[PDB]
Amino acid sequence: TLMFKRFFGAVRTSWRDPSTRGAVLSLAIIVTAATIFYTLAEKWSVIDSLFYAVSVGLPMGNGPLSPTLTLSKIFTLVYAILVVGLFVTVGGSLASAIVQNN
Amino acid sequence: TLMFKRFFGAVRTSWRDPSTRGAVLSLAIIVTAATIFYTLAEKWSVIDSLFYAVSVGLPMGNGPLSPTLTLSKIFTLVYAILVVGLFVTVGGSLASAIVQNN
Amino acid sequence: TLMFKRFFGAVRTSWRDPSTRGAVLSLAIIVTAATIFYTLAEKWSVIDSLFYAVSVGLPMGNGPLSPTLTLSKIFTLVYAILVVGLFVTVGGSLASAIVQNN
Amino acid sequence: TLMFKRFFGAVRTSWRDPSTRGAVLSLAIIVTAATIFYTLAEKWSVIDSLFYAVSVGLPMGNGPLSPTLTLSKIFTLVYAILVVGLFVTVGGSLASAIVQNN
Ligand SMILES: [Ca+2]
Ligand SMILES: [Ca+2]
Ligand SMILES: [Ca+2]
């Protein structure tokens, strides 16, 4: 029953596009890229890898998960600084869409 | 003894509405669902669930609690992206309403 | 060595005033109240109470600290929704004020 | 393995400048001083210190690292309010500069 969320959520209001919710596109590369890195370098599972990635722009909250290696530390910074912007506007957009969707 | 805040804040500032504080309603809907899932899925108590729900889109931080199921992990992930926007705007309007009460 | 931050920072650009930074007043009262609550309920030392209270407006991160009692859990959500906006507007004001000093 | 992000990230969007990204300069100062503090006060390594400093101004999330002494606790609070702004606009300018680069 996580249906009503995924379907009346990420799927449904993710298809409200201006020229400037090409930020979603921008987001997806970056999150995905981070996830790959986390999986490979930090050795974590895909979900956990994704969880960490999502965490560094959003108030969600990383898990037990934190970087243990120098590359993972440094990388987390550089990614984090960028994506924080990206997460924001997208969240705003979706929020906006939700309200005029009822 | 939080009787001060609940009357002076939480049930103070909501009694003030524009068009865009339709956002409250959506946020309410999001949170409730989230909490329910947590209680059912993640087995935690109503508040612990409820706390966790709030934790994900505001910066406060979750202490001990973190999702342990892949299913709940994705639920957070999906749910995270929707609610944050809502949190932002309710956060802002609500804050402004304090300021216009002094 | 914090003196350089404290004087060159949260007072040096704190005293940059319009009418609309009356939120600083509000921030002070609200942060104070929460701190008091934390001190009382959570048993915590005043600094720690203060630490936690600020942790929840800002992207900070609490320490190892988090609400362990039900009232504290309940209180935190309520407070966080209120105070976040305050933290935001003040932050922007203060931010803008560093930049205006170059 | 992060060479994509380092060169095509927070060195690419740097060579894209108006004058109100003097905020990057501000952030560098505040961040650097913070790092200096944390290394010294809290005994941590430089990388860890940097991470922690970043962690208080972004949704990133402090790992194990958090302050343990009053001096550092207070300092975080002070710094936290200051940096929160500078981070935010940095993310924003940076963020837009990604979409303007596509
Ligand atoms: Ca986070
Ligand atoms: Ca926080
Ligand atoms: Ca955290």
Numbering used by the authors:
A (entry chain A), B (entry chain B), C (entry chain D), D (entry chain E): 5 to 106
Sentences from the paper on this structure:
Three different diffraction datasets were analyzed to identify different ion occupancy states (by virtue of the I4 space group symmetry, the six monomers yield three crystallographically related tetramers). A total of nine crystallographically distinct tetramers were considered in the analysis, revealing four different occupancy states, I to IV, with 0, 2, 3 and 6 Ca2+ ions, respectively. In state IV, there are four Ca2+ ions in SCa and two additional Ca2+ ions, one in the site corresponding to S3 in KcsA near Gly65 and a second ion near Pro63 (a different sub-state is seen with the ion position shifted by 2.1 and 1.1 Å towards the intracellular surface). Lastly, there is a tetramer with a single Ca2+ ion located at the centre of the intracellular vestibule with no ions observed in the pore, as observed in the KcsA and NaK structures, assigned to State I. More details about the locations of Ca2+ ions in the 3.4 Å dataset 3 (3.4 Å resolution) and 3.6 Å dataset 1 (3.6 Å resolution) crystal structures are provided in Supplementary Fig. 5. Analysis of crystallographic data indicates that the presence of bound Ca2+ at diagonally-opposing sites inside the selectivity filter controls the diameter of the conducting pore.
